[PDB]
Enzyme design. Sequence first.
Site, PDB file in Angstrom:
ATOM      1  N   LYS A  34      -5.412  -2.027  -4.450  1.00  0.00           N
ATOM      2  CA  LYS A  34      -4.682  -2.964  -5.304  1.00  0.00           C
ATOM      3  C   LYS A  34      -4.170  -2.286  -6.576  1.00  0.00           C
ATOM      4  CE  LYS A  34      -6.955  -7.243  -3.793  1.00  0.00           C
ATOM      5  NZ  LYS A  34      -7.841  -8.371  -4.193  1.00  0.00           N
ATOM      6  N   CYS A  35      -3.172  -2.906  -7.202  1.00  0.00           N
ATOM      7  CA  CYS A  35      -2.560  -2.392  -8.427  1.00  0.00           C
ATOM      8  C   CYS A  35      -3.398  -2.717  -9.665  1.00  0.00           C
ATOM      9  CB  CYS A  35      -1.147  -2.961  -8.593  1.00  0.00           C
ATOM     10  SG  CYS A  35      -0.031  -2.658  -7.204  1.00  0.00           S
TER      11      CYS A  35
END
Length: 143
Positions: A34-35
Amino acid sequence: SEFYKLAPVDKKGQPFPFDQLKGKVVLIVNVASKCGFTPQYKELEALYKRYKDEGFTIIGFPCNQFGGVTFPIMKKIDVNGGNEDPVYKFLKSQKSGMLGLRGIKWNFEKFLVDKKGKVYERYSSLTKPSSLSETIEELLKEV
């Protein structure tokens, strides 16, 4: 070494054989799928840029179990559990605490590997990549 026998799938879905890593100091880092972790990738990239031509590389393993770079990024894996990737099986067999959990605790745990393929040390997610520079330098100078 068993290390050079490893061949995880890369980002393009192709074999990435660790035998190409012979004579290189290697930082193996599990990376967030994930970012929102930009500072972490910036520090890793800085390490890579600094030392790559000394015979150093970083292999980043995306993983989604804990919910912009130029070094090798691999296909997403599990680092823990029944579907644990062989790379992480091997790493944990070389460096884990004597008692308690052997598994990866969080994003950005790091393993530093010898020029001869021997795991030197395992570092927690909180230890910044820059803090490893001096240790990387002594491994790069290995006879």
